[PDB]
Amino acid sequence: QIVLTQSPAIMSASLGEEITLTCSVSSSVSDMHWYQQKSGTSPKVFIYSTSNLASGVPSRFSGSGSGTFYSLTISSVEAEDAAYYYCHQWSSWTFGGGTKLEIK
Amino acid sequence: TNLCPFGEVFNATRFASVYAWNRKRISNCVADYSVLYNSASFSTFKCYGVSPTKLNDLCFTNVYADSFVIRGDEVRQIAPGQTGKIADYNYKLPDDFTGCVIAWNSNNLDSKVGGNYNYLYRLFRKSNLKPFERDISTEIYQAGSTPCNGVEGFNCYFPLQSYGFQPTNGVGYQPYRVVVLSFELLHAPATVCG
Amino acid sequence: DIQMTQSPVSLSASVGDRVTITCRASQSISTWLAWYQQKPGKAPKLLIYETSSLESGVPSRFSGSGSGTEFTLTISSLQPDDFATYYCQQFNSYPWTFGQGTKVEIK
Amino acid sequence: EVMLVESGGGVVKPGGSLKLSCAASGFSFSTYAMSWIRQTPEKSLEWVAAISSGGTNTYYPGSVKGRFTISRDKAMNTLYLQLSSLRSEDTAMYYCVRHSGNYVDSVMDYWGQGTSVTVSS
């Protein structure tokens, strides 16, 4: 079985600067998806297959990685990115923890 | 109008593991791939160079059906051009392929509560595979200047790791049975027509 | 005995610079490499493992990359608690051969 | 354009059973797979039910297999999740989810709004 871990618990980077997110798997998986919820709202999809932006997300977001480490990095964070960012794959049954990116 | 054995290759009682897969030849047959296509119990029915609905009126001379069992997430690596663990060490398809790759879920069938430890896969090999090439070689593997000769010590490891197949594993780590239907054309008369 | 060349051997970089340290082998290992960070006076610490996987508890500005023969580490914005040396180490072949050293003094 | 609503959530008794309905219309329903995703109030999401596109492949995790029976009907274009014999762990926010491929392997594109279920007396 697989537990997907995200560390640290709550990350914070000041406005316009670059932060990155981690999603570490206990084994090897091919891809990794990234869903994002705001407070009091259902989560929506941002990235499928670790590098493709969804139709609706701004094109500052990105991410890479394969195997046992997956990323979601923002080159310049904005004030609407005050949210939880859950990573999830096909092979888990359980989502990631969710680093609540709050601005600084 | 005597139909071909596909009830020997699909609903078999036990498939083989991937590092020694099962190659079976089809000869003196008449098939019907629409029954394979319009069964709707398969999960991944991708054909890679012939259109699937026109497959019935296409008359070949030998079909090769290879059967093995992989992890559910690694069905992507049974395509022409993909690389990875299974692709370059276990079962490599050539990048001029024309065939159909079939896959469906088989957890209830291949998973004990303690977990089946008889499905294995190749982890260490000297180089990659040329296509359609099996290597059933249980010799230990080695790295820098000194050879082992069967000691299994540091720097020497068994070329196999076991699949962990538990009934609570995930929809992507459940054991998937795949069948790589592969077509050929030798300088010979037509033997399978449909 | 895969001796690894770690280059550059010494450099300086100010706060907020994107630095890149590369480590290149002779025999092609297959994504079995780990980095380290040795503060001057005590033991090394495992930062990057298996050439991409960031170890837990480490600040996420560290990020290893590369595959094949040569491998690279990079830091996004250099922080004033990172003026240490970074060794690279293979573990494909079992005789372990570590790097050379990179004395990153901040100017 | 595409929208999925949840209705049928309330408060049930411990050991009680009810049926969560998810209405869906606006897209081609019988060519996509769907799933249920629950969220305990520690805000840690969790996969709880998964059905294929046609209806021949049904998937449940190791904890709720034998308590939750998923359903699918393309006539009214709905989705049913038949809860039964609930423990104290099923107090959550249950979501309705549409996949992108013809199997459960693909990414989850569109989500529902969310229904409240709790296990309390």
Added chain:
Amino acid sequence: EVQLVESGGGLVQPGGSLRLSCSASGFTFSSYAMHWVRQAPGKGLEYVSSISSNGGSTYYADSVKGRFTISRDNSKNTLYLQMSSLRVEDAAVYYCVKHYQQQLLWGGPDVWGQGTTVTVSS
């Protein structure tokens, strides 16, 4: 909390002897093979010795082997490094690492010790 700590160390004349000790606590000791790695002062790192999960197999570097021997004890949570026929090139700190994996030996150290200074003089 996984932690390793060592004791011993000191000085020895060339040709003498010294036994080191690596006492570990906080994890399953019998399922995690451990190795030694040395570092001459002011120089780079170096690999010296190792042992398997139950003392079955050992493998040293070719530059040190023959004069060294390693031993461990699963009932005492200790790892020993018995040195003999000492020279000037061994005057180094001797860290104690442990594996990331279990019972497979094919790669990956996990956490490092604290080291104890071993030097030679006259």
